[PDB]
Design a protein around this ligand. Sequence first.
Ligand code: HEM
Ligand SMILES: *[C@@H]1O[C@H](CO)[C@@H](O[C@@H]2O[C@H](CO)[C@@H](O)[C@H](O)[C@H]2NC(C)=O)[C@H](O)[C@H]1NC(C)=O
Ligand SMILES: [Ca+2]
Ligand SMILES: [Ca+2]
Length: 357
Amino acid sequence: AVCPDGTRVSHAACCAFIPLAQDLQETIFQNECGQDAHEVIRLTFHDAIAISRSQGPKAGGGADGSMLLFPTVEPNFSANNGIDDSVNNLIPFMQKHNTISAADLVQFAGAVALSNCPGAPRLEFLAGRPNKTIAAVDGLIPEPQDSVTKILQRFEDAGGFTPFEVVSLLASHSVARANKVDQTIDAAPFDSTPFTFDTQVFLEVLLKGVGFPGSANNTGEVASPLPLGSGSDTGEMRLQSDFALAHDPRTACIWQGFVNEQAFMAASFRAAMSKLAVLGHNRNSLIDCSDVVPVPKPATGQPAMFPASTGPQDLELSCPSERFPTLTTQPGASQSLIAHCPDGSMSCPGVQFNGPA
Ligand code: HEM
Ligand SMILES: *[C@@H]1O[C@H](CO)[C@@H](O[C@@H]2O[C@H](CO)[C@@H](O)[C@H](O)[C@H]2NC(C)=O)[C@H](O)[C@H]1NC(C)=O
Ligand SMILES: [Ca+2]
Ligand SMILES: [Ca+2]
């Protein structure tokens, strides 16, 4: 088909997504893997995971836009704390680009946000999800204080995800920060490169913890290897769940398998996201509009490195059957501060709209 902007697309129905992508970039992302992007990416996951095979259809409809359609329900469950901001940012687009369902909008926005992150894969995008659904029940969202067994059961019950796929999805923590875990500090990154979709997160969770970026008594948080912060440049935070998955006999080797394996990580994540994006739907009934997803930003091609002040002696290995790669260490006597802004600055407020959530 040929869209009103001359763009040759696969199916005419995919044409509407073109103006939506540009609106999202101009209005809330500004072509950066920043704050707003990170929040949207998380919403994609929270919207999709709320579904249960065992409990049945009444428990939730998966990737159905329920977060946008019922803003006063799910966003208020304790496990969804902090999600309100992204819901309020997306609602205006739902109202404007009114030929696109809330469900499609959520998934597409995630694909767009991710494309702004260097190293990220170009996600598959299928459209056609219905604009009507029900509010999901509480308890379907995995929490940081959960055990590995519990986390794996949840993902299995949601859509038959295997342990490999679960760890694959956690690649998103390479461009993630925390605002609600510790209320005294904001934007605590999960790895030293929160604006780069690389394998640093997998390496840094394997290092020995030496302190906490804020308070020491927070549910779901464990000691961090890079706690030092100053001003807006908050220190690194480590979640119990990530730490646990990196050391459990069932997931230890899978976790290590991604260290310094950029292409393998990206491809595995794309595969897992392919499944997650259609939870609650039959993929044979959705149209393929992958060609309308923006081309992602390229990485530099550099391998993973031990951040300054850390080295091989700080590793807490758990996979007995695979050799840990030889990596270099970035020079320096002490820890470098992790920048709060992608342009290196320490001041960069993202656009935020007021809304019902
Ligand atoms: C395995 C279960 C998971 C747990 C327990 C978990 C937990 C968390 C927690 C506690 C935060 C911090 C939220 C805050 O306080 O602001 C977070 C952030 C985030 N997570 Fe997860 N997560 C999980 C899976 C995933 C998956 C599968 C994705 C995939 C899209 C994802 C994407 C994100 C992103 C992008 C952020 C950062 C948001 C921001 O920077 O504002 N997470 N996650
Ligand atoms: C999907 O459902 C939503 C929720 O009803 C629709 O949202 C309304 O859209 C109109 C414009 O068409 C706006 O004036 C309303 O303010 C929106 N309602 C809310 C609560 O925001 C949306 O139009 C529907 N989209 C499709 C494709 O069916
Ligand atoms: Ca949902
Ligand atoms: Ca990173």
